[PDB]
Amino acid sequence: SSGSANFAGVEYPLLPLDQHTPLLFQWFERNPSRFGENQIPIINTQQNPYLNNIINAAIIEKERTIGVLVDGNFSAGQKKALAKLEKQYENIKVIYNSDLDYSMYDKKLSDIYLENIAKIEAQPANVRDEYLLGEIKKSLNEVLKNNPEESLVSSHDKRLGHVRFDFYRNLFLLKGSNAFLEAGKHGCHHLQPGGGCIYLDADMLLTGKLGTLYLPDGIAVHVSRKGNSMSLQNGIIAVNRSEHPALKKGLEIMHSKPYGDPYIDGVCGGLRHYFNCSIRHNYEEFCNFIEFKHEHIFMDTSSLTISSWR
């Protein structure tokens, strides 16, 4: 521990994330056919040189495990290319999302709907959200018509866009360093069970070594300052431990809300609940408090060109 930062009447120690804390990048590919059969299936265009950025981060942080969480229907040659990348850079560990078991974070959709119907019925009739009650009842009806066993994981798994890799990003960060050991990644000499993790968007250009970070209660996230507004953002998520209470609270919210969003609820909601940033608090002050800052990271370079999913 170093100093401390105040927010909403609570004093938070700036907890350390040592230099052995692993870095984490993520590539979930919807269209693996846009790469060669023996190509590394991670985008690497002039506008989005993301494979190059990852390799540059692995070269700069030579004494740090660099995890690449990948997903998509990859061809055999593409997987062999990923293994070749793992061999060309010792610290790069490729983790296939399908090799991780996320069932311990799952919940039945019908259970969420039933609990919400009970909790709307348990409140005085003059304040019940009746429109929401109706929408939850239609959602449950459709679940019973199409797949009664539908769950958070399975429903998000069927998504084809950013929501899916947001969801799995949060779950992986809950696993923390433990995900590396669960996937059988050998030679991760520095990883401790229960260790943390620093997730970075691939467009977060490292220009130097990160050293040791000091974050309030051991967590910080990106703050986008595009144009005249600012917003909490999951483009960077640094935690000093597995099962971090802020991300665990985001998962709690998603277990309780009928239509929880991995970003709005799993990240922003969890942070604001954990740190007591209500709608009556200053959102800008909280952004300044929780912001992940670093002089050796050129942040969100995808805004100089085009977004890879937009």
Ligand X SMILES: CC(=O)N[C@@H]1[C@@H](O)[C@H](O)[C@@H](CO)O[C@H]1O
Which residues define the annotated binding site?
A: 26-28, 50, 165-166, 169, 201-203, 235, 300, 302, 307-310
CA atoms within 13 A on the CB side of 194: 1
Note the residues at the interface with Mg ion (CB under 5 A): 201, 203, 300, 302
Q: Tokens in use for 42? A: 């991670």
Angstrom distance (rounded) from CA 227 to CA 34 = 33
Residue 290 binds which of ligand UDP, ligand X, Mg ion, none (CB < 5-8 A, kind-dependent): none
Binder to ligand UDP among 203, 217, 252, 265 (CB under 6 A)? 203
- Using CB under 6 A as the binding rule, whether residue 234 contacts ligand X is answered as yes
Helix (H) or strand (E) holding 181: helix 178-182
Q: Which residues are annotated as a binding site for N-acetyl-D-glucosamine?
A: 166
DSSP string covering 97-151, please? Answer: GGGS--GGG--BHHHHHHHHHHHHHTS-TTT--HHHHHHHHHHHHHHHHH-TT-B
202 binds, among ligand X, Mg ion, ligand UDP, none (CB under 5 to 8 A by kind): ligand UDP
> Alpha-carbon distance 25 to 54, whole Å?
7
In the beta sheet, which residues pair with residue 67? 24, 93
- Of 150 and 201, the one with the shorter C-beta distance to ligand UDP is 201
Nearer to ligand X among residue 150 and residue 166 (C-beta): 166
Listed in order, strand segments (DSSP E) in the chain are 4-7, 10-17, 23-28, 66-71, 92-96, 195-200, 205-206, 213-216, 219-224, 231-241, 297-298
Beta partners for 219? 239
Which among Mg ion, ligand UDP, ligand X, none contacts residue 308 (Cβ within 5 to 8 A by kind)? ligand UDP
User: Which tokens hold the place of 219?
Assistant: 């967590």
Q: Given the rule CB under 6 A, which of 26-34, 148-156, 191-199, 233-241 is the region that contacts ligand X?
A: 233-241
Q: Within the chain, what is the greatest distance between any pair of CA atoms?
A: 65
Contacts with ligand X in 167-226 (CB under 6 A)?
none
At closest approach, how far in Å is the CB of 168 from ligand X?
A: 11
Structure tokens belonging to residue 33: 């056919």
d(CA 231, CA 155): 27
Nearer to ligand UDP by Cβ, of 91 and 302: the residue is 302
> Judged by CB under 6 A, does residue 166 bind ligand UDP?
no
Return binding residues for Mn(2+).
203, 300, 302
Helix, coil or strand: residue 178: helix
Tokens 């019908």 sit at which residue? 110
Binders of ligand UDP in range 228-247 (CB under 6 A): 235
Contact with ligand UDP (CB under 6 A): which of 28, 35, 168, 292? 28
Footprint of ligand X on 248-307 (CB under 6 A): 263
Binding site partner of 27, from ligand UDP, ligand X, Mg ion, none, Cβ cut-off 5-8 A by kind: ligand UDP
With CB under 6 A as the contact rule, the residue among 150, 166, 217, 265 that binds ligand X is 166
The residues binding ligand X (CB under 6 A) are: 162, 166, 233-235, 263
The residues binding ligand UDP (CB under 6 A) are: 26-28, 30, 165, 201-203, 235, 300, 302, 307-310
